Write a protein that binds this ligand. Sequence first.
Ligand SMILES: CCCCCCCCCCCCCCCC(=O)O
Ligand SMILES: CCCCCCCCCCCCCCCC(=O)O
Lengths: 129, 129
Amino acid sequence: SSFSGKYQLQSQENFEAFMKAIGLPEELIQKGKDIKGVSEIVQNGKHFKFTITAGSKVIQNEFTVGEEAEMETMTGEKVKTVVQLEGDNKLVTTFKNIKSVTELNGDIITNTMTLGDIVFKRISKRILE
Amino acid sequence: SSFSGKYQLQSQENFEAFMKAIGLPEELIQKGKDIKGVSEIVQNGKHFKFTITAGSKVIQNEFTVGEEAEMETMTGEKVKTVVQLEGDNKLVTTFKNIKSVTELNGDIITNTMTLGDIVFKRISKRILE
Ligand SMILES: CCCCCCCCCCCCCCCC(=O)O
Ligand SMILES: CCCCCCCCCCCCCCCC(=O)O
């Protein structure tokens, strides 16, 4: 019912391949590929504040689902997109050629980002605090 | 008397002044000044693994107290220095013209970085898992 929490990355697939596909330099990719950090979500109804840690970067995005917002991506580009909430537990959007699904089941968020033939999947676990 | 844990940044003083002094790009200073993320320490005796979130960056460093190590700073520069343990609860190091003190007080960690007339102070709180 609520996405709010601090989430410890547990495992991911295709980090290097995804970051390569979107144009990040290999030297940066190798520096961040094995970090497993903590991302935070604060949900208040349709409103979300994301503090995402991915690789060597921290990105802070804010959006209300259903409203167009400017979201910073891993390339530094700020993309205009709308994130929708399907049910109470799935956040979906598309930007550039990437389909993103953020799904909360119990305490586990599965984030699946699909770019052509690359499925970049992150599994994180809510720190029960 | 263990530093180990995950710590959420609670407050900080003089981020912008310190980051300017070390020459961080202004765009990174403005993006990162309000981010309050989670850093992690793993301590094994004198050996420490740090996953530090500072501004928009994640930095992973690894060293042993009393032995010279190579550490990545906030600018990405590599520096060679020795980290000492002071008074059994403070990690202290001096690299270039910076003195860093990382002090443990129960669930609170205070990182104080002094550069000339600038004292960059971070106060973080242990996440109870
Ligand atoms: C426009 C969206 C921002 C894209 C930033 C890409 C970095 C990976 C995105 C995954 C974060 C989704 C939240 C779940 C927690 C996590 O996996 O860290
Ligand atoms: C080797 C020098 C450290 C790298 C430079 C990072 C600048 C900020 C350092 C924060 C100290 C991290 C340790 C305690 C946790 C925290 O305060 O987040």
